[PDB]
């Protein structure tokens, strides 16, 4: 079994193909705490032991990004993603990830130590309380932006170029790739903002415990921000709805504000693709800004999985 | 009379100066129950009435942190600390405290409502059974980490920076301050762990009533964990000694595990200081990790009072 | 009040004259982030709101150049420079700048849209948290290289010519001007390299956060690169000192390598002047190369302010 895993620090995206040929996609959050969760009978808990420490999954408080890729939690979050993927527990080969400006140097040349360190990380032994864990055998690396735009690039003429805009949890990366992946025109990495900007705006708009715990609430609000029906039910307070909406919009305005300034650094692209968890949040602005024709603008309603699905399709 | 009071939710630390110029330090625990304690003649009891409720000091069961700063118990715990400080009962002016991430906003800019709410709290009338209570007149606020490192910072060159590591009862906060308090380089607040981790590990290692009552026992064990002589006398059971020691060490390993990961978020510091009640518990690890020279590593054997002593020295 | 402002994208240089006739010079960095910095009491913060967005000054990570001249940050960086200049907050008239190859066309003829766009930029409303901002009323444009060499040119005979070498943050511009500003002999604009080359070499030599934040550290090292005493104190690691010095020198060798090739494009000059932030870094090489006599070679120890001081002297 081969599983493609885009283990981002906000969400882990999984992709693999079944015996019947169907291609599966899964997303598991990076929400864990350094202690087992106790259950007296009604709550199903995931209690892990990674090196010596015990960990457990849970909707904790949202609080390095880079350090995380080689952390014990990363390993736990990945196994957990496997365990909750629906896949049968087994030995598995995986392909994981390390960002555009990390994979490529300043001259857009692919950039050993970090890579072997990444591989070595899944060499850590994990155990699940009252259950069995998958066995990670072989562990390939792919750049982030590119795999998501590949099936479109195949169709592009060598002279046209896809502008890929990825809005992640804590970074916004934009790249411009020549048709038929015949070259990387430009890469712009910006680790100063991501969806977490909006997330924290919501956790504050509603005095919310700044922990991964409330991240599910914050997410529901951001996602259903245009449906007052949903908002009313999720938020039992009428006053807090107008407030969260104002705070949510200023944060959104900041996102759109920046992606737009950055797009002015790119020119000559013929096609546009928006990916990442927050793709939906800046989609309209960039479409408007770039003024690219509908048939050349790419977006999906599963944006957080566009990368790992693209990776899956390439190396399946 | 002016008393500097660092009223933490685990221990209240007092600092003030006498007529003869000697600077005094006192520590009183936050151990109270909602009911008067009855004494028929041999036990001295402290029975208070705060708003309408009666409270009494006692070694209760260890069981919000934030809510506590504006609670009726806080007021009681402070008065009690005054009453047991050795100071003569009188009208007094005080300086109390509110944490690094509360005192400073995200841009390390000092952060009104909470502050006035804090002051207003000591406006609550208290009475002592068979005795007189101090009278709290004026009530200044200081950030937590900084005051403890100030007298060292004065000696530091504007380019060097002190890394202050505070291990409290339920949180671990680390900050990096530029020499001569010429700027705050970084603040890392982590409310997920504190000494209470070890404390609860001990109360469980010895089926102990999880209440502030046994906290004195748990404390004695943690403190004398390296002296089998003391442990044997405090623990009449030989078997429970090896057990408590194993549970105590796993908890310690977790503390050291985390402070170390966090220190990897800090860089460029030239001096290191460890403070807070649990300073002694992570002292060796951070010294080893940071590999700072002995003459630049700061620790005391009164760590729980480093903050209030520092506050005392500044605003005496 | 009239202030001459050379707002470069690395450093803003200010020049103006006081009532008592003394001519003042100030330099403020272009270091800001898109979010207010929070202070709980010890750090003085500068929190701005420019159009709708909030900005704050801070030593951020070093990451268009051209786009910056018409950006909201530019406005913020200028106001901030005014606020920290020592000047009393007031309504002020300013003269700002737009580079040699922008001010002059290919035939060295002065080159409307950009100019009005520049002026219009300071028309943006700004506010300071807990403070008042200056009021920008009238907003003249001067070429970059020339103003710095004017007081020397006045003394030059119409046949002699000053070779002005400006090493800025991201560009190196050289021009040759006839005595008594009687004509521009040649202009060579090179936007491929600047001091940022050395800067990034240092941030990498010391795994440093590539952000404007560490720019102050990188700067201190470059400036004190010949004093091991300073380097030892600024760098607590002995090993990192030899490394940063080797990386710093290769970058310097590249700078000297290029200015020298470029100087071979110029001939007939009788006097030489080196200006800009990095003047100090290539000063020795060009002096050696051109072999101009000491009394005809011009350099100062305030090179980053030579341009705005020259502008000040002309239009005061």
Curated annotation (Swiss-Prot), chains A, B, C:
Hydrolase as a keyword? no
Sorted alphabetically, the keyword list is: Plasmid, Plasmid partition
Question: Biological process GO annotation list?
Answer: plasmid partitioning
Q: Does the keyword Transferase apply?
A: no
Mind telling me which InterPro entries this protein's record contains? ASKHA_NBD_ParM_R1-like (IPR056367), ATPase_NBD (IPR043129), ParM/StbA_N (IPR009440), ParM_C (IPR048345)
Q: Which GO terms describe its molecular function?
A: identical protein binding
Q: Which Pfam families match?
A: ParM_N, StbA_N
Known partners and oligomeric status: Homopolymerizes into double helical protofilaments with a longitudinal repeat similar to filamentous actin.
Described purpose of this protein according to its UniProt entry: Involved in the control of plasmid partition. Required for the accurate segregation of the plasmid.
Family to which the UniProt record says this protein belongs: Belongs to the plasmid partition ParM family.
Protein name as it appears in the record: Plasmid segregation protein ParM
**Origin organism of this chain?**
Escherichia coli
Query: Which gene underlies this protein?
Result: parM
């Amino acid at each position: 079994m081969l599983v493609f895993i885009d283990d981002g620090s906000t969400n882990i995206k999984l992709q693999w193909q079944e015996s019947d040929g169907t291609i599966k996609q899964h997303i598991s959050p990076n929400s864990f705490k350094r202690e087992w969760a106790v259950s007296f009978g009604d709550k199903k808990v995931f209690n892990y032991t990674l090196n010596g420490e015990q960990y457990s999954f849970d909707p904790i408080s949202p609080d390095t990004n880079i350090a995380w890729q080689y952390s014990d939690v990363n390993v736990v979050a990945v196994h957990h993603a496997l365990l909750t993927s629906g896949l049968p527990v087994s030995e598995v080969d995986i392909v994981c990830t390390l960002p555009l400006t990390e994979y490529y140097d300043r001259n857009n040349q692919p950039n050993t130590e970090n890579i072997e360190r990444k591989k070595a990380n899944f060499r850590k032994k994990i155990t699940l309380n009252g259950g069995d864990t998958f066995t990670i055998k072989d562990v390939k690396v792919m750049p982030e932006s590119i795999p998501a735009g590949y099936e479109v690039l195949q169709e592009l003429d060598e002279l046209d170029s896809l502008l890929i805009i990825d809005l992640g949890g804590t970074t916004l990366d934009i790249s411009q790739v020549m048709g038929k992946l015949s070259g990387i025109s430009k890469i712009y990495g910006d680790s100063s903002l991501g969806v977490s900007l909006v997330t924290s705006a919501v956790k504050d708009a509603l005095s919310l415990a700044r922990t991964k715990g409330s991240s599910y609430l914050a997410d529901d609000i951001i996602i259903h921000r245009k449906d007052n029906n949903y908002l009313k039910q999720r938020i039992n307070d009428e006053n807090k709805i107008s407030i969260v909406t104002e705070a949510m919009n200023e944060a959104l305005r900041k996102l759109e504000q920046r992606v737009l300034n950055t797009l002015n650094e790119f020119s000559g692209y013929t096609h546009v693709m928006v990916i990442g968890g927050g793709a939906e949040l800046i989609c309209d602005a960039v479409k408007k800004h770039t003024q690219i024709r509908d048939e050349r603008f790419f977006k999906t309603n599963n944006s957080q999985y566009d990368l790992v699905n693209g990776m899956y399709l390439i190396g399946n």
